[PDB]
Amino acid sequence: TPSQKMKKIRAGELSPSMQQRTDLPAKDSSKSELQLAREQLHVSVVPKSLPCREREFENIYAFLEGKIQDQCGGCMYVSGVPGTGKTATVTGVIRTLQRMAKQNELPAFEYLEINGMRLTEPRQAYVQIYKQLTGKTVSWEQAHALLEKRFTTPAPRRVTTVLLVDELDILCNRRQDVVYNLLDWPTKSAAKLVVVTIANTMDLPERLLMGKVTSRLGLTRLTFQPYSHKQLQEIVTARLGGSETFKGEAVQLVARKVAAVSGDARRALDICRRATEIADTAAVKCVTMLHVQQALAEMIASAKVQAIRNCSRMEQIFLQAIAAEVTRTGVEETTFMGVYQQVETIAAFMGVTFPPPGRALRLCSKLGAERLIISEHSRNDLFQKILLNVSADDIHYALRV
Amino acid sequence: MEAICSSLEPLFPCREAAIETLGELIGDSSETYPSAIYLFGHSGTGKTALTRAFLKECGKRQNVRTAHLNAIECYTTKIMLEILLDSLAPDQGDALKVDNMLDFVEQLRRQAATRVEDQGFLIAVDNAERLRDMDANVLPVLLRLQELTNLNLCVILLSQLPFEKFYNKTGLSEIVCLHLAQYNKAETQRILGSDFQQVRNQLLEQKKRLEICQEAVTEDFYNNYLNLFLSVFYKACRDVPELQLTARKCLSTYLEPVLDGSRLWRHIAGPLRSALTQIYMRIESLELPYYAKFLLIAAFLASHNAAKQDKRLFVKLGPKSFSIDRLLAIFYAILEEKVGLTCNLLSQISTLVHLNLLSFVSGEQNIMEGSARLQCTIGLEFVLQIGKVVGFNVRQYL
Amino acid sequence: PLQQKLMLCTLVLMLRNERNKDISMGRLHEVYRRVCAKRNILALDQAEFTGTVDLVETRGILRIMRKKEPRLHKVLLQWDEEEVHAALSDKQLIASILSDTACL
Amino acid sequence: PEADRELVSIRRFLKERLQRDYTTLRGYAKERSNVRLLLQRTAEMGESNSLLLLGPRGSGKTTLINSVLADLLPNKSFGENTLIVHLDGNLHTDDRVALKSITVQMQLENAADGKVFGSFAENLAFLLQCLKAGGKHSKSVIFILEEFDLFCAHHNQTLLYNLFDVSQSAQAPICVLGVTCRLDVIELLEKRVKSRFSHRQVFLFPSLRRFEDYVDLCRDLLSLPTGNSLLLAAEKIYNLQNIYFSRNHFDPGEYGFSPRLRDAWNKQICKVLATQQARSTLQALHDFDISEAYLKNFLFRLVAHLRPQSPHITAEKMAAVGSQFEGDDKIELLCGLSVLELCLIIAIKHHSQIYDRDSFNFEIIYARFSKFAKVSTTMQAVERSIVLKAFEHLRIAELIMPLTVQKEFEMHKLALTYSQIHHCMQRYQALPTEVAQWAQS
Amino acid sequence: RTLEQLVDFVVGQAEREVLPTAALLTGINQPDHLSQFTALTQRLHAQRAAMVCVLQSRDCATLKAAVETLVFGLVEDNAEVERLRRSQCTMKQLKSWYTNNFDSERRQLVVILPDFECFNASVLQDLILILSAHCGSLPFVLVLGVATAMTAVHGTLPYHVSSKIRLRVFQTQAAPTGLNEVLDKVLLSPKYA
DNA sequence: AGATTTTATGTTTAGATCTTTTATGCTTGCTTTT
Numbered sequence A: 001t002p003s004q005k006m007k008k009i010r011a012g013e014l015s016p017s018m019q020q021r022t023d024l025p026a027k028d029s030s031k032s033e034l035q036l037a038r039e040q041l042h043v044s045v046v047p048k049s050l051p052c053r054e055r056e057f058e059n060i061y062a063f064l065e066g067k068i069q070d071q072c073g074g075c076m077y078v079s080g081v082p083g084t085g086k087t088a089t090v091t092g093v094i095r096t097l098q099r100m101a102k103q104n105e106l107p108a109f110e111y112l113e114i115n116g117m118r119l120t121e122p123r124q125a126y127v128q129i130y131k132q133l134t135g136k137t138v139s140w141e142q143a144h145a146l147l148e149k150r151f152t153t154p155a156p157r158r159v160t161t162v163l164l165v166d167e168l169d170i171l172c173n174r175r176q177d178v179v180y181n182l183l184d185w186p187t188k189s190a191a192k193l194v195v196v197t198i199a200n201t202m203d204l205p206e207r208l209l210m211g212k213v214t215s216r217l218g219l220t221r222l223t224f225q226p227y228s229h230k231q232l233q234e235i236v237t238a239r240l241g242g243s244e245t246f247k248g249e250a251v252q253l254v255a256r257k258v259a260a261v262s263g264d265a266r267r268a269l270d271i272c273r274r275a276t277e278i279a280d281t282a283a284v285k286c287v288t289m290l291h292v293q294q295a296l297a298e299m300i301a302s303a304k305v306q307a308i309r310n311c312s313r314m315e316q317i318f319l320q321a322i323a324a325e326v327t328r329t330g331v332e333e334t335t336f337m338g339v340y341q342q343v344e345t346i347a348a349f350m351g352v353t354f355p356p357p358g359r360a361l362r363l364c365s366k367l368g369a370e371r372l373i374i375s376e377h378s379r380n381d382l383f384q385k386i387l388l389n390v391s392a393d394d395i396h397y398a399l400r401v
Numbered sequence B: 001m002e003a004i005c006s007s008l009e010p011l012f013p014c015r016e017a018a019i020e021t022l023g024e025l026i027g028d029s030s031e032t033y034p035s036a037i038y039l040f041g042h043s044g045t046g047k048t049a050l051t052r053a054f055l056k057e058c059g060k061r062q063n064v065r066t067a068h069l070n071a072i073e074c075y076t077t078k079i080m081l082e083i084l085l086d087s088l089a090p091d092q093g094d095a096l097k098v099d100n101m102l103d104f105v106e107q108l109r110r111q112a113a114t115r116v117e118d119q120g121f122l123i124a125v126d127n128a129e130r131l132r133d134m135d136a137n138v139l140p141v142l143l144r145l146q147e148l149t150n151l152n153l154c155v156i157l158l159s160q161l162p163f164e165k166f167y168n169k170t171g172l173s174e175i176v177c178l179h180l181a182q183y184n185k186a187e188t189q190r191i192l193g194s195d196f197q198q199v200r201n202q203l204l205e206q207k208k209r210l211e212i213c214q215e216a217v218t219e220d221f222y223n224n225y226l227n228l229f230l231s232v233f234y235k236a237c238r239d240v241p242e243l244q245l246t247a248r249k250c251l252s253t254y255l256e257p258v259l260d261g262s263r264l265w266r267h268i269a270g271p272l273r274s275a276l277t278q279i280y281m282r283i284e285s286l287e288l289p290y291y292a293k294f295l296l297i298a299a300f301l302a303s304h305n306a307a308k309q310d311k312r313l314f315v316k317l318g319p320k321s322f323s324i325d326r327l328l329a330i331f332y333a334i335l336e337e338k339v340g341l342t343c344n345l346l347s348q349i350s351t352l353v354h355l356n357l358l359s360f361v362s363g364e365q366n367i368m369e370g371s372a373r374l375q376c377t378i379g380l381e382f383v384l385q386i387g388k389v390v391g392f393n394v395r396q397y398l
Numbered sequence C: 001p002l003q004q005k006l007m008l009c010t011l012v013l014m015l016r017n018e019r020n021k022d023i024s025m026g027r028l029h030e031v032y033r034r035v036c037a038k039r040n041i042l043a044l045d046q047a048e049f050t051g052t053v054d055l056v057e058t059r060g061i062l063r064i065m066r067k068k069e070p071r072l073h074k075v076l077l078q079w080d081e082e083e084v085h086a087a088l089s090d091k092q093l094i095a096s097i098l099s100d101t102a103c104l
Numbered sequence D: 001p002e003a004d005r006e007l008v009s010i011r012r013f014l015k016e017r018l019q020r021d022y023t024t025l026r027g028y029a030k031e032r033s034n035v036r037l038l039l040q041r042t043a044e045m046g047e048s049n050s051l052l053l054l055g056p057r058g059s060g061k062t063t064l065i066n067s068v069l070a071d072l073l074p075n076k077s078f079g080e081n082t083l084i085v086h087l088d089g090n091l092h093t094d095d096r097v098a099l100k101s102i103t104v105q106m107q108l109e110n111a112a113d114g115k116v117f118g119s120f121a122e123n124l125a126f127l128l129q130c131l132k133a134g135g136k137h138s139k140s141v142i143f144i145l146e147e148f149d150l151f152c153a154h155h156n157q158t159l160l161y162n163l164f165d166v167s168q169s170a171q172a173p174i175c176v177l178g179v180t181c182r183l184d185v186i187e188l189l190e191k192r193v194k195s196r197f198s199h200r201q202v203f204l205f206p207s208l209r210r211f212e213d214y215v216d217l218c219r220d221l222l223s224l225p226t227g228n229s230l231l232l233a234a235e236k237i238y239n240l241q242n243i244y245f246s247r248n249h250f251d252p253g254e255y256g257f258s259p260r261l262r263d264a265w266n267k268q269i270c271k272v273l274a275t276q277q278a279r280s281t282l283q284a285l286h287d288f289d290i291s292e293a294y295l296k297n298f299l300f301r302l303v304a305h306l307r308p309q310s311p312h313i314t315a316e317k318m319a320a321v322g323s324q325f326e327g328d329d330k331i332e333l334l335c336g337l338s339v340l341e342l343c344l345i346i347a348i349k350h351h352s353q354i355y356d357r358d359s360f361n362f363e364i365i366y367a368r369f370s371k372f373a374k375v376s377t378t379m380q381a382v383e384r385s386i387v388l389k390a391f392e393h394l395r396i397a398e399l400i401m402p403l404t405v406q407k408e409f410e411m412h413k414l415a416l417t418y419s420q421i422h423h424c425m426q427r428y429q430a431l432p433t434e435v436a437q438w439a440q441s
Numbered sequence E: 001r002t003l004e005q006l007v008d009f010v011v012g013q014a015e016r017e018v019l020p021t022a023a024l025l026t027g028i029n030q031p032d033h034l035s036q037f038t039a040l041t042q043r044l045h046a047q048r049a050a051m052v053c054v055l056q057s058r059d060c061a062t063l064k065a066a067v068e069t070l071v072f073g074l075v076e077d078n079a080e081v082e083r084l085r086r087s088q089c090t091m092k093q094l095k096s097w098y099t100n101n102f103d104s105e106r107r108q109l110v111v112i113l114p115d116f117e118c119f120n121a122s123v124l125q126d127l128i129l130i131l132s133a134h135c136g137s138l139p140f141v142l143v144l145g146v147a148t149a150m151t152a153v154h155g156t157l158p159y160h161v162s163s164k165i166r167l168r169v170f171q172t173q174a175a176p177t178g179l180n181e182v183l184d185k186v187l188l189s190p191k192y193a
Numbered sequence F: 001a002g003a004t005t006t007t008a009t010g011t012t013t014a015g016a017t018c019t020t021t022t023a024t025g026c027t028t029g030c031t032t033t034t
């Protein structure tokens, strides 16, 4: 019966196994050097010690070591744009603290962790934190009551517990009860909780948290700045090891054109993998700079001029006449009727006949499904509004040069 | 595909081209079907009856599973999926259950069989114009149900509108458009004259009149009568069922001089121009209380006389809005008797509103606060009739 | 990042030159492409420009009022330009962009 | 008769090829090679990738994915070391429906014969715990998210954030593969979800913008293939059916044409497509929409007309189906109206031409009609109620649309250009001369 | 007299597409006519000729609620002649119930609409199109209660909706005539003190 | 060792909320005929 399976799942007594491969994975020594760089360059392979994040490592390490040794509890808020080494640094600090507590240089501590985007509801965090404690799956009300019984009541020998919370802005909602509980539990003396909260926006406690929640979040804070031109080069040359499969100018061009956009490290580690895959099909064993230029042009794509050049001729006449009506009437939003009149003018100039308006609505629907233009549902023909989504100069660049 | 068109053509005169196109696209079940067909036309063009007779003949003659729908019935998508799978998965009983669009696609994927038996499926959706008003994932899935279910099915759609009305923001898959043209006068005469044996039998079961009718009710007589009928009635309507239901009554009036002993056209053209004024009305004086009559003509003057003219008429575009106190002021000005403001008078105001003699153009939520705006919704001739029965001459105040 | 610098300079230019502060993402991107063309450096496409403006939004420099379509989103500056000039720390570039009225 | 049956075999063959050829892919060499090497590296080396097919609707994206899966699946390595999870944005309208479908298709322990137990939160927790519990020793999942832009519309984009994050993590080697028609799907993503996406993108613009490629495509779609190609195609389809579309695919071994029949058919097809009339029909068809679904729709309407009395395709048949395609379908509705509704539309056209497209009303149009009807000498007899029912008959065809009040006073808009009414004036049958004179002035 | 004519109309439809339908030009005094429609249901049940639903305007704000109260009224009326939840009384369940019961014998499915003037127009037109879609499979009869005049019926029914209507007009006697009859035969009777 | 309410839980749909945007209306300030 299924109910015994669900009871063994909710009690945690069966581990959720995944199916194993029929065939064994290939041995490491059969790999090419370019494949070795392709697998060292994967974003999932976190280094044991992160380059160019030593200052933030010392900051989070000093905070967590002081909160653990003082047995007091508290809270911290780290923030920054995605791909800047936030969660990797926090888990590296926590792994270093666990390695130190294993050798009895530090007091032992529990390490709970959650993430706000793995929860369907903000209150489901109560289900998950308790699942990192006892392992039972229970309802969020009973889990919140048991967590309050654990944290509000002094029960020696209570051990220190560090609750990392990624994705803090998803847990907010309007009532903000969950984030208030998670930041209010450390303030009680009986709970030794040290909650760290990772988020993207710098101004989150003032922008969307309540005043008491911002007051509980405190003034200790850390900001992960975007990677510069040089740190992105140090990251990729640390990932490659001593291998010369990448040219140094190729990594310099990847870092120079990724740091100018975002400062994300995942973009550099993905563009270098695509450059390795491009160099693999050319049967070269060094990733020369034009392979990096091809991978950069592929992964920072701008394929709308190709879409306008690949459109059918009546759709190109339609794309000319929408920009013509925008230039004529001045306002950016045009009705289909004046667009069709400019269509008849341009088609009378070019000499081809144009399809009747019931087929011009099919052309407008195709351009609006391709998102070359923004357009309404077709049920209100001749009065539907047609925004131009592509820029007006891109159409002339496509249909002239 | 030949037997179906041969079996539908006697039932449907002047539709040999549409029946030929339907029997080429979805006639044989061994041949693969187009992914969707959309035939369209006016009212009375005969598309519901044509797809019903076609689906019935294909289901009786061949292996196909047919499913006819009316999309007005499907206020939620679950109703449509449950009826569609009740027809395409027969004898499932009350154990049938469909949660959403995905369960419908999976249970239709289970219905696939071997290619030797050459099974097919057919889905007709009458009133398909309502499909664009619902969940906005029903129509795109219905236009590619064959690709999704991996199954030899065509989804016919039926509407009074062209398919140019049906495109959405996300686009649509390809469809085979088909047009049912409405008939001209000659084909309409052939269609009205195709039921001649039925009306001849109906007269022969209804005794000198029996022999004098059966010796003179031959095919040229009914054709000349239908020519005299369509010479006057085709200007107002091309709708074939309306022409049938009026032409039978007009023949019942027309036939009398023949039974009683050209030379017919004037005697019918009297009544024939009277039946022309009763077209679309399918038929086979509002008494009121006295103070309700005065309230109704006061509301007509309030909606017809504008706000500025009351000061000159009573101190002694469209219909205008009026507040209830303006109605009571005009009612007391035209009453010249001065009854008290009892409960029954304002109750007459509310029950004139409930009969759609007045209307609530705004307000509604606050009738009592004085922010309500009413609008009289009757014609002038009813007001003049009420003023005749009452004795209040309305035209003095207009 | 340099593209975020160009976006902030074009937004400061459009806010200074125009009485109507209803700046859309498309109306800003069409000026940003002309500014990148006159600087002789490659411009981002609109799909990458939306993510660039979203990354500038996390610093609190901007606020994006969402609309039905990504082109129709309304950028709203939330710093004064005297703070934006000290934050960009590239006065030789901002002096070139803000003196570039003809590219609007 | 043998000649009556060879045409039936040719017609069933051509129809089955135009409708059910789910894996054959013309064109896209480098793009198919990119998708194939990416899925092959995910299945063999355990790399966690992600990909995003892009292009106009009607280009072969689903056909490209089916071609790559059909050539990878019978390898007895990709088929044993990789489980495939299709998802569709039109059927999986919510995250929990897609999550129950993921739990079923991966055959997780809590699935049990297609009825997943537990809540949406328990399903997400069990799926993420099964994925975290795996590694390089575990089987590779290949997610295939058709209509990816509808998956972007879900709450928090939460399922997308999970599906990318496993690809960013040292867990089970999954390969997310979106397929969508929008060219700017990537700006719909949240910045966290956009960061975890690997920005490689494959655009599938059709390779037949040139007219000669369109004529070669229309020739290859109608020609009968050589019989050894039927043997190799039936061999590949049998290989993909020994191990989803394979229950109802092409199966071209059912049909085996004689060499004289294939030679006469390909001769007639080349002779028809060499003519100027068939090339002009294909030129107008290519001028409207170049996508292959449009040409396959036109060719299905063409192949469906092969009666035994007329075995051959001819240029006049293609011209007839092309004349069927290009005609306006609102003029064909205007010609079906009776003379009273046509007089109402002429009064509406006069009110629109005079007042410069101002919104009208039933009362204004009935007054403008009665001013003609008093001297029309054929329209004197109509009641106001018949003209009102004719106005409602105009309204239900959406030739008149409300501005979005009594039904006789509601404001309205004409849904027609004046040229459509002017062409209705010439295409109308048995139009009285009084209406034809009133329409001019 | 009008009761015998309406019962003869329903039985004549039972002896036998457009739905047959009978406008009943009743007076302004709407509450009084519930006894008339109740006597019609009593006669139709006593003859075993039909089963009757009664659609009040308060029960039918939307097409969904109208279909639910219609099917629930027909099934519970048949149950009361000789309880499913209102969420599941689909028209498909009405067809399955009619096939399980009366296909072996035809009872009419009379649908009284006593307050025709009070209805939403779009809900009423969609309901008439729904009942017209099921003709042949389900024998429907649609008697109405028009307090005003037949011009209201011709106004609220558009060209498409009146294409599927075969209505017949019955006339209830005038309210002042009923007042005069009551005042002469009751309040002026010798037998009351 | 199996059937029945009983209860606790999750989903879904109708209603409260936030926010923009648009409009008639409430009042003002002249404006102008009798």
Ligand SMILES: Nc1ncnc2c1ncn2[C@@H]1O[C@H](COP(=O)(O)OP(=O)(O)OP(=O)(O)O)[C@@H](O)[C@H]1O
Pocket (backbone or CB within 6 Å): A042, A043, A044, A045, A046, A047, A050, A051, A052, A053, A080, A081, A082, A083, A084, A085, A086, A087, A088, A089, A199, A200, A235, A265, A266, D192, D195
């Ligand atoms: N300084 C660095 N040195 C080496 N690798 C890095 C560095 N920073 C980032 N990476 C790589 O990029 C990935 C970034 O993941 P991480 O979890 O740090 O991102 P994040 O900032 O938490 O993103 P988000 O804010 O969207 O959650 C890591 O897997 C790591 O492999």
Ligand SMILES: Nc1ncnc2c1ncn2[C@@H]1O[C@H](COP(=O)(O)OP(=O)(O)OP(=O)(O)O)[C@@H](O)[C@H]1O
Pocket (backbone or CB within 6 Å): B011, B012, B013, B014, B015, B041, B042, B043, B044, B045, B046, B047, B048, B049, B050, B159, B160, B191, B240, B241, E160, E163
């Ligand atoms: N060509 C024809 N020959 C004979 N009868 C016809 C023909 N066309 C229509 N009819 C008759 O029209 C009647 C009903 O037409 P039908 O209801 O199919 O029109 P419709 O298009 O469904 O109308 P609507 O679009 O308003 O629902 C049928 O009883 C049928 O007998």
Ligand SMILES: Nc1ncnc2c1ncn2[C@@H]1O[C@H](COP(=O)(O)OP(=O)(O)OP(=O)(O)O)[C@@H](O)[C@H]1O
Pocket (backbone or CB within 6 Å): D018, D019, D021, D024, D025, D026, D027, D028, D056, D057, D058, D059, D060, D061, D062, D063, D064, D181, D292, D293, D296
């Ligand atoms: N390159 C191609 N090779 C073979 N057939 C093609 C190709 N492109 C399009 N087609 C044909 O076009 C029709 C539709 O193609 P397909 O189903 O691949 O489009 P799609 O990718 O599903 O589009 P969308 O996903 O936007 O609906 C199919 O019948 C297919 O035979």
Ligand SMILES: [Mg+2]
Pocket (backbone or CB within 6 Å): A086, A087, A166, A198
């Ligand atoms: Mg993180």
Ligand SMILES: [Mg+2]
Pocket (backbone or CB within 6 Å): B047, B048, B126
């Ligand atoms: Mg119909």
Ligand SMILES: [Mg+2]
Pocket (backbone or CB within 6 Å): D061, D062, D146
């Ligand atoms: Mg597809």
